[PDB]
């Protein structure tokens, strides 16, 4: 399953396995990793609209973000990714869809979008949570005298 996943989304699997957020891609039967530069949360700005006014029917499938590496660094354009990853290239374009509701992970919560327009941020707990974990309530044999 891990082989199949690393073929699917090599970034996440490499980040989990290596132990740190790292960009990855398969080189056949091996993975090439490269550590990702962390960016402060306060240095990230979301553009309100995911539309592309220059062309009809084409929408950014994932919110645009402007960010700066340092608190005074130049503002750098980019596009949001998964698990708060910022992609330097704004290329994830999809045809625009009616009834377009989306929640995107952003910092500690989500950034709800409607009709390719920013609606509001959401706290992490504002959305019902389902657990893929399986509880193993192993308590400990208490000391007995």
């Amino acid at each position, epitope marked *: 399953l891990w082989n199949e996943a690393r073929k699917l989304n090599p970034n996440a699997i490499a980040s989990v396995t290596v132990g740190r957020r790292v960009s990855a891609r398969m080189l056949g039967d091996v993975m090439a990793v490269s550590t990702c530069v962390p960016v402060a949360a306060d240095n990230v700005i979301v553009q309100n609209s995911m539309r592309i006014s220059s*062309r009809p029917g084409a929408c950014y499938s994932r919110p645009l973000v402007s960010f700066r590496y340092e608190d005074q660094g130049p503002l750098v354009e980019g596009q949001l990714g998964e698990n708060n990853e910022l992609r330097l290239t704004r290329d994830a374009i999809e045809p625009c869809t*009616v009834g377009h509701r989306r929640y995107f992970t952003f910092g500690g919560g989500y950034v709800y979008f409607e009709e390719y327009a920013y609606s509001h941020q959401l706290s992490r707990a504002d959305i019902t949570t389902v657990s893929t974990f399986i509880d193993l309530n192993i308590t400990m044999l208490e000391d007995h005298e």
Partner: antibody
Framework: QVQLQQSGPELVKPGASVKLSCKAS????????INWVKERPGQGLEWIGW????????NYNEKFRGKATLTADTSSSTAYMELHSLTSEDSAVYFC?????????????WGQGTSVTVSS | DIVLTQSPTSLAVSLGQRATISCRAS??????????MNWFQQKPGQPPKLLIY???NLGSGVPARFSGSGSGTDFSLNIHPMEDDDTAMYFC?????????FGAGTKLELK
């Protein structure tokens, strides 16, 4: 349930300027583009531009730089036309349209239309 | 710009049989594997209505007798059977690039 009110017919002197209106109703006016389409019976129906109410941004068909102009009033939930230098041939029907039912962004909601005329 | 041509400028058709028109886009209008071709019918005096979007998807509130096909630059509209409700004016148009245009137009009437 989604309705696009429009102004009535206009009798105008050629070369003047007018203001057509598209009162949107039945949905959040700011969340969908408002397209304007020119309709003269002689020629095929012609798209002149569309305006994004939420941002106020708009793209026009190229030939309609100064002849047409679009504004939007979110408070009134109404997009507006600003026609300028109305030539005799500019006398035509103008449709205001938007998206909302078809899965992709297509002009599937329409107003009753507005027949503008210029004469003497 | 994308220019749209329809082989029948007018097409008289009797009731009940196949009705077919064509639409040419003079170049590709396909993006994301989707042909951004849309078909409109306009009964005279009232605003046009969507019939087919993405060149194959039936517009809502439309009988299945309407049917569309095509990809690349050639697109076609198929109707069967054709009824009095189809005696209208029809437009094929694209939504690929910003100055999106419309077809010259097809007229369907009775022989």
């Amino acid at each position: 349930q989604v309705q696009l009110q429009q102004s009535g017919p206009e009798l105008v002197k050629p070369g003047a300027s007018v203001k057509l209106s598209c009162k949107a109703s039945g949905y959040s006016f700011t969340t969908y583009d408002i397209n304007w389409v020119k309709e003269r019976p002689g020629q095929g129906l012609e798209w002149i531009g569309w305006i994004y109410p939420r941002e106020g941004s708009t793209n026009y068909n190229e030939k309609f730089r100064g002849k047409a102009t679009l504004t939007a009033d979110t408070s009134s939930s109404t997009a507006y036309m600003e026609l300028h230098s109305l030539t005799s041939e500019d006398s035509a029907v103008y449709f205001c349209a938007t998206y909302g039912s078809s899965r992709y962004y297509t002009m599937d909601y329409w107003g009753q239309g507005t027949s503008v005329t210029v004469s003497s | 710009d994308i220019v749209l041509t329809q082989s029948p400028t007018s097409l008289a058709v009797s009731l009940g049989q196949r009705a077919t028109i064509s639409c040419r886009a003079s170049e590709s209008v396909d993006n994301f594997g989707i042909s951004f071709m849309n078909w409109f019918q306009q009964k005279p005096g009232q605003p046009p209505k969507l019939l087919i979007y993405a060149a194959s998807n039936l517009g809502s509130g439309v009988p299945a007798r309407f049917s569309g096909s095509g990809s690349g630059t050639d697109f076609s509209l198929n109707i069967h059977p054709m009824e009095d409700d189809d005696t209208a004016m029809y437009f094929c148009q694209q939504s690929k690039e910003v100055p999106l245009t419309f077809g010259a137009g097809t007229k369907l009437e009775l022989k």
